[PDB]
PDB file of C-alpha atoms and ligand atoms in Angstrom:
ATOM      1  CA  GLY M   7     109.708 112.707 115.499  1.00 45.55           C
ATOM      2  CA  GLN M   8     109.978 108.984 116.237  1.00 44.67           C
ATOM      3  CA  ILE M   9     111.219 107.559 112.906  1.00 47.11           C
ATOM      4  CA  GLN M  10     111.988 103.813 112.683  1.00 52.16           C
ATOM      5  CA  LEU M  11     115.021 102.078 111.196  1.00 57.27           C
ATOM      6  CA  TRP M  12     113.049 100.496 108.314  1.00 56.34           C
ATOM      7  CA  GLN M  13     111.557 103.912 107.450  1.00 53.24           C
ATOM      8  CA  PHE M  14     115.019 105.494 107.498  1.00 56.22           C
ATOM      9  CA  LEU M  15     116.385 102.996 104.999  1.00 57.79           C
ATOM     10  CA  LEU M  16     113.530 103.704 102.534  1.00 56.91           C
ATOM     11  CA  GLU M  17     114.252 107.417 103.000  1.00 55.49           C
ATOM     12  CA  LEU M  18     117.879 106.842 102.093  1.00 57.16           C
ATOM     13  CA  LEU M  19     116.895 104.449  99.311  1.00 54.91           C
ATOM     14  CA  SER M  20     114.408 106.996  97.896  1.00 57.09           C
ATOM     15  CA  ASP M  21     117.265 109.243  96.662  1.00 56.74           C
ATOM     16  CA  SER M  22     120.189 108.017  94.530  1.00 58.10           C
ATOM     17  CA  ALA M  23     122.335 110.826  96.015  1.00 54.23           C
ATOM     18  CA  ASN M  24     122.888 108.289  98.838  1.00 54.16           C
ATOM     19  CA  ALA M  25     124.186 105.529  96.491  1.00 53.38           C
ATOM     20  CA  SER M  26     127.695 105.763  98.059  1.00 51.85           C
ATOM     21  CA  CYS M  27     126.238 104.170 101.199  1.00 53.76           C
ATOM     22  CA  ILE M  28     122.930 102.485 100.173  1.00 55.96           C
ATOM     23  CA  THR M  29     121.108 101.612  96.906  1.00 58.29           C
ATOM     24  CA  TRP M  30     118.378  99.444  95.421  1.00 57.66           C
ATOM     25  CA  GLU M  31     119.951  96.670  93.377  1.00 61.80           C
ATOM     26  CA  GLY M  32     118.267  93.483  92.193  1.00 62.87           C
ATOM     27  CA  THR M  33     114.565  92.690  91.879  1.00 60.69           C
ATOM     28  CA  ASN M  34     111.601  94.148  93.857  1.00 60.61           C
ATOM     29  CA  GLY M  35     112.785  95.068  97.333  1.00 59.44           C
ATOM     30  CA  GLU M  36     116.481  94.208  97.005  1.00 59.10           C
ATOM     31  CA  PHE M  37     119.133  96.678  98.084  1.00 56.09           C
ATOM     32  CA  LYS M  38     122.754  96.698  99.222  1.00 55.01           C
ATOM     33  CA  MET M  39     124.591  98.851 101.710  1.00 56.89           C
ATOM     34  CA  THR M  40     127.508 100.146  99.710  1.00 57.93           C
ATOM     35  CA  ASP M  41     128.801 101.633 102.992  1.00 61.34           C
ATOM     36  CA  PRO M  42     127.322  99.944 106.066  1.00 59.77           C
ATOM     37  CA  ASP M  43     129.462 102.048 108.416  1.00 59.87           C
ATOM     38  CA  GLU M  44     128.098 105.257 106.883  1.00 59.64           C
ATOM     39  CA  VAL M  45     124.528 103.943 107.053  1.00 57.96           C
ATOM     40  CA  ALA M  46     124.957 103.117 110.743  1.00 60.37           C
ATOM     41  CA  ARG M  47     126.514 106.521 111.414  1.00 59.57           C
ATOM     42  CA  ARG M  48     123.680 108.440 109.766  1.00 61.45           C
ATOM     43  CA  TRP M  49     121.087 106.439 111.749  1.00 60.19           C
ATOM     44  CA  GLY M  50     122.915 107.168 115.006  1.00 63.79           C
ATOM     45  CA  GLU M  51     122.770 110.853 114.132  1.00 61.99           C
ATOM     46  CA  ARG M  52     119.062 110.744 113.256  1.00 61.93           C
ATOM     47  CA  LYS M  53     117.968 108.836 116.340  1.00 60.34           C
ATOM     48  CA  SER M  54     120.534 110.781 118.428  1.00 59.27           C
ATOM     49  CA  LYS M  55     122.135 107.516 119.551  1.00 56.72           C
ATOM     50  CA  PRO M  56     125.870 108.139 118.859  1.00 58.48           C
ATOM     51  CA  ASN M  57     126.768 104.650 120.199  1.00 58.30           C
ATOM     52  CA  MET M  58     125.357 103.302 116.898  1.00 59.83           C
ATOM     53  CA  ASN M  59     127.616 101.317 114.548  1.00 60.62           C
ATOM     54  CA  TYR M  60     127.158  98.583 111.890  1.00 68.56           C
ATOM     55  CA  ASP M  61     127.055  95.652 114.365  1.00 69.35           C
ATOM     56  CA  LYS M  62     124.167  97.261 116.284  1.00 69.23           C
ATOM     57  CA  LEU M  63     122.303  98.205 113.121  1.00 70.13           C
ATOM     58  CA  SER M  64     122.661  94.604 111.833  1.00 73.43           C
ATOM     59  CA  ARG M  65     121.241  93.350 115.152  1.00 71.16           C
ATOM     60  CA  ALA M  66     118.233  95.693 114.944  1.00 69.37           C
ATOM     61  CA  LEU M  67     117.393  94.372 111.459  1.00 68.95           C
ATOM     62  CA  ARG M  68     117.250  90.835 112.908  1.00 70.60           C
ATOM     63  CA  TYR M  69     114.024  91.864 114.680  1.00 68.54           C
ATOM     64  CA  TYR M  70     112.581  92.667 111.226  1.00 66.81           C
ATOM     65  CA  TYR M  71     113.037  89.099 109.862  1.00 65.29           C
ATOM     66  CA  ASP M  72     110.309  87.621 112.079  1.00 65.40           C
ATOM     67  CA  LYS M  73     107.988  90.555 111.267  1.00 68.32           C
ATOM     68  CA  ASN M  74     108.331  89.852 107.493  1.00 69.14           C
ATOM     69  CA  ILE M  75     109.527  93.424 106.924  1.00 71.57           C
ATOM     70  CA  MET M  76     112.786  92.392 105.338  1.00 68.25           C
ATOM     71  CA  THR M  77     115.217  89.500 105.016  1.00 70.06           C
ATOM     72  CA  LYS M  78     119.043  89.147 104.670  1.00 70.59           C
ATOM     73  CA  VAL M  79     120.207  87.618 101.442  1.00 74.72           C
ATOM     74  CA  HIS M  80     122.420  84.716 102.559  1.00 73.97           C
ATOM     75  CA  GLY M  81     125.485  84.217 100.371  1.00 71.09           C
ATOM     76  CA  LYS M  82     125.934  87.859  99.386  1.00 70.34           C
ATOM     77  CA  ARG M  83     126.975  90.281 102.174  1.00 74.13           C
ATOM     78  CA  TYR M  84     125.457  93.688 103.019  1.00 74.46           C
ATOM     79  CA  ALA M  85     122.522  92.639 100.721  1.00 74.20           C
ATOM     80  CA  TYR M  86     118.920  92.763 101.981  1.00 72.00           C
ATOM     81  CA  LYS M  87     115.349  92.596 100.707  1.00 75.48           C
ATOM     82  CA  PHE M  88     112.293  94.523 101.845  1.00 72.17           C
ATOM     83  CA  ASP M  89     109.082  92.376 101.846  1.00 69.54           C
ATOM     84  CA  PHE M  90     105.685  93.914 101.178  1.00 70.27           C
ATOM     85  CA  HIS M  91     103.940  91.519 103.563  1.00 73.91           C
ATOM     86  CA  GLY M  92     105.425  93.044 106.720  1.00 75.72           C
ATOM     87  CA  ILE M  93     105.959  96.567 105.385  1.00 75.49           C
ATOM     88  CA  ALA M  94     102.199  96.868 104.742  1.00 79.04           C
ATOM     89  CA  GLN M  95     101.543  95.820 108.325  1.00 79.48           C
ATOM     90  CA  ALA M  96     104.297  98.038 109.768  1.00 80.04           C
ATOM     91  CA  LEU M  97     102.692 100.889 107.819  1.00 82.07           C
ATOM     92  CA  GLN M  98      99.536 100.536 109.960  1.00 84.34           C
ATOM     93  CA  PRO M  99      98.660 102.225 113.298  1.00 83.65           C
TER      94      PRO M  99
ATOM     95  CA  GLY J 596      92.056 111.516 107.523  1.00 82.01           C
ATOM     96  CA  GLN J 597      93.097 112.267 103.933  1.00 80.49           C
ATOM     97  CA  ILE J 598      94.484 108.967 102.628  1.00 81.81           C
ATOM     98  CA  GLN J 599      95.846 107.925  99.215  1.00 83.93           C
ATOM     99  CA  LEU J 600      94.700 105.105  96.913  1.00 85.93           C
ATOM    100  CA  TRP J 601      98.031 103.214  97.134  1.00 88.92           C
ATOM    101  CA  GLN J 602      97.923 103.754 100.876  1.00 88.34           C
ATOM    102  CA  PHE J 603      94.397 102.368 101.061  1.00 89.83           C
ATOM    103  CA  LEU J 604      95.205  99.144  99.196  1.00 92.35           C
ATOM    104  CA  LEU J 605      98.178  98.398 101.472  1.00 88.55           C
ATOM    105  CA  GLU J 606      95.815  98.905 104.435  1.00 87.41           C
ATOM    106  CA  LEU J 607      93.369  96.395 103.003  1.00 85.40           C
ATOM    107  CA  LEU J 608      96.207  94.077 102.022  1.00 85.99           C
ATOM    108  CA  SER J 609      97.605  94.227 105.601  1.00 93.14           C
ATOM    109  CA  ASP J 610      94.663  92.170 106.933  1.00 93.40           C
ATOM    110  CA  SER J 611      93.657  88.776 105.499  1.00 92.08           C
ATOM    111  CA  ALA J 612      90.084  89.373 106.744  1.00 91.96           C
ATOM    112  CA  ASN J 613      89.778  91.329 103.463  1.00 97.11           C
ATOM    113  CA  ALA J 614      90.801  88.339 101.251  1.00 95.10           C
ATOM    114  CA  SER J 615      87.260  88.181  99.788  1.00 94.53           C
ATOM    115  CA  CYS J 616      88.004  91.468  97.956  1.00 96.49           C
ATOM    116  CA  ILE J 617      91.841  91.772  97.936  1.00 97.51           C
ATOM    117  CA  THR J 618      94.810  89.513  98.877  1.00 96.19           C
ATOM    118  CA  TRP J 619      98.550  89.210  98.340  1.00 97.55           C
ATOM    119  CA  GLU J 620      99.271  86.355  95.958  1.00 97.77           C
ATOM    120  CA  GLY J 621     102.537  85.767  94.123  1.00 99.56           C
ATOM    121  CA  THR J 622     106.031  87.072  94.856  1.00100.79           C
ATOM    122  CA  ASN J 623     107.125  90.366  96.477  1.00 98.86           C
ATOM    123  CA  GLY J 624     104.463  92.997  95.867  1.00100.90           C
ATOM    124  CA  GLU J 625     102.023  90.862  93.863  1.00102.78           C
ATOM    125  CA  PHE J 626      98.311  91.002  94.681  1.00103.05           C
ATOM    126  CA  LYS J 627      94.935  90.357  93.068  1.00103.16           C
ATOM    127  CA  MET J 628      91.535  91.873  93.665  1.00100.36           C
ATOM    128  CA  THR J 629      89.259  88.981  94.449  1.00 97.44           C
ATOM    129  CA  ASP J 630      86.394  91.511  94.297  1.00 96.82           C
ATOM    130  CA  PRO J 631      87.319  94.649  92.408  1.00 97.26           C
ATOM    131  CA  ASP J 632      83.763  95.998  92.754  1.00 96.69           C
ATOM    132  CA  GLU J 633      83.957  95.711  96.535  1.00 94.62           C
ATOM    133  CA  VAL J 634      87.412  97.331  96.606  1.00 95.51           C
ATOM    134  CA  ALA J 635      86.100 100.330  94.658  1.00 93.86           C
ATOM    135  CA  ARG J 636      83.055 100.579  96.924  1.00 94.65           C
ATOM    136  CA  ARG J 637      85.141 100.689 100.113  1.00 94.26           C
ATOM    137  CA  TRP J 638      87.423 103.332  98.550  1.00 95.17           C
ATOM    138  CA  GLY J 639      84.462 105.568  97.642  1.00 95.10           C
ATOM    139  CA  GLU J 640      83.271 105.366 101.230  1.00 93.70           C
ATOM    140  CA  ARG J 641      86.762 106.180 102.599  1.00 95.26           C
ATOM    141  CA  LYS J 642      87.334 109.210 100.328  1.00 93.08           C
ATOM    142  CA  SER J 643      83.645 110.237 100.496  1.00 89.91           C
ATOM    143  CA  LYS J 644      83.489 109.946  96.701  1.00 89.69           C
ATOM    144  CA  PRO J 645      80.270 107.930  96.213  1.00 88.93           C
ATOM    145  CA  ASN J 646      80.561 108.016  92.389  1.00 89.08           C
ATOM    146  CA  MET J 647      83.478 105.553  92.713  1.00 88.70           C
ATOM    147  CA  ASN J 648      83.498 102.169  90.950  1.00 86.32           C
ATOM    148  CA  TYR J 649      85.999  99.689  89.423  1.00 85.85           C
ATOM    149  CA  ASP J 650      86.467 101.504  86.085  1.00 85.01           C
ATOM    150  CA  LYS J 651      87.486 104.708  87.927  1.00 83.97           C
ATOM    151  CA  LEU J 652      89.659 102.822  90.397  1.00 85.43           C
ATOM    152  CA  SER J 653      91.595 101.184  87.516  1.00 86.95           C
ATOM    153  CA  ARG J 654      92.026 104.655  85.950  1.00 85.72           C
ATOM    154  CA  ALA J 655      93.477 106.051  89.196  1.00 86.59           C
ATOM    155  CA  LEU J 656      96.073 103.260  89.326  1.00 85.63           C
ATOM    156  CA  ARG J 657      97.319 103.994  85.794  1.00 86.93           C
ATOM    157  CA  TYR J 658      98.749 107.210  87.327  1.00 86.06           C
ATOM    158  CA  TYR J 659     100.912 104.957  89.569  1.00 85.28           C
ATOM    159  CA  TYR J 660     102.521 103.137  86.605  1.00 85.44           C
ATOM    160  CA  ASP J 661     104.735 106.063  85.587  1.00 84.69           C
ATOM    161  CA  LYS J 662     105.490 106.808  89.269  1.00 89.12           C
ATOM    162  CA  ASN J 663     106.766 103.207  89.542  1.00 88.67           C
ATOM    163  CA  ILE J 664     104.487 102.728  92.541  1.00 92.02           C
ATOM    164  CA  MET J 665     102.768  99.782  90.956  1.00 90.61           C
ATOM    165  CA  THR J 666     102.272  97.996  87.658  1.00 92.09           C
ATOM    166  CA  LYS J 667      99.428  95.837  86.198  1.00 94.22           C
ATOM    167  CA  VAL J 668     100.188  92.208  85.440  1.00 90.30           C
ATOM    168  CA  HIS J 669      99.383  91.943  81.704  1.00 87.93           C
ATOM    169  CA  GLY J 670      97.806  88.637  80.671  1.00 84.63           C
ATOM    170  CA  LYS J 671      96.006  88.348  84.003  1.00 83.37           C
ATOM    171  CA  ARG J 672      93.011  90.479  85.136  1.00 84.03           C
ATOM    172  CA  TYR J 673      92.681  92.285  88.466  1.00 82.99           C
ATOM    173  CA  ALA J 674      96.368  91.347  89.225  1.00 83.08           C
ATOM    174  CA  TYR J 675      98.870  94.048  90.182  1.00 79.66           C
ATOM    175  CA  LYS J 676     102.329  94.504  91.690  1.00 77.98           C
ATOM    176  CA  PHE J 677     103.597  97.110  94.151  1.00 77.99           C
ATOM    177  CA  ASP J 678     107.174  98.329  93.356  1.00 80.16           C
ATOM    178  CA  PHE J 679     109.479  99.465  96.141  1.00 78.07           C
ATOM    179  CA  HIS J 680     111.129 102.108  93.903  1.00 75.83           C
ATOM    180  CA  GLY J 681     107.978 104.291  93.719  1.00 76.68           C
ATOM    181  CA  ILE J 682     106.655 103.371  97.172  1.00 74.42           C
ATOM    182  CA  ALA J 683     109.861 104.478  98.912  1.00 72.55           C
ATOM    183  CA  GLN J 684     109.512 107.801  97.093  1.00 76.13           C
ATOM    184  CA  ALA J 685     105.750 108.080  97.832  1.00 76.68           C
ATOM    185  CA  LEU J 686     106.441 107.819 101.590  1.00 82.16           C
ATOM    186  CA  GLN J 687     108.421 111.071 101.420  1.00 84.01           C
ATOM    187  CA  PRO J 688     106.741 114.385 102.501  1.00 81.78           C
TER     188      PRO J 688
HETATM  189 CO1  LIG I1122     106.560  88.311 101.846  1.00 84.86          CO
HETATM  190 CO1  LIG I1123     111.104  98.872  90.658  1.00 84.65          CO
END
């Protein structure tokens, strides 16, 4: 059904078989997209939106910064951090 | 519906109207039970297990240590920390 981008990333992150494109790395919440192109592609497939690429995926994450769901780590690139404040709220109907 | 203990605490944590019994405090994932007795009571009601109390609630959480869902902050009391490793896995069917 209707799965959301943040949920998709935790799905990918939940299995180290996906490490070639995405993996936890760092302290609580921190991950890196080892292949952002591949992560965008897989999302596009899942949400049957085959116009999806990395630029569009990066834009959609921007929405999540103001919701406190996650935040981009400035300085590093392709690095991000899930925040429990917003995730706990996003987890609610 | 049938809801899980870790799921229940995130629900409570999602709303600061519950601060009198449970609140985020600290860095990513860190929380403390301002009223552990109240938290156990509300759980018992939710899972229709009216034998529930703090001692049993703290037992149930110990299960989550080896699942990496959460950990107890040693040296403090009633302080805990949700881990995104285990949570990402717990969200999976
Ligand atoms: Co936060
Ligand atoms: Co961890």
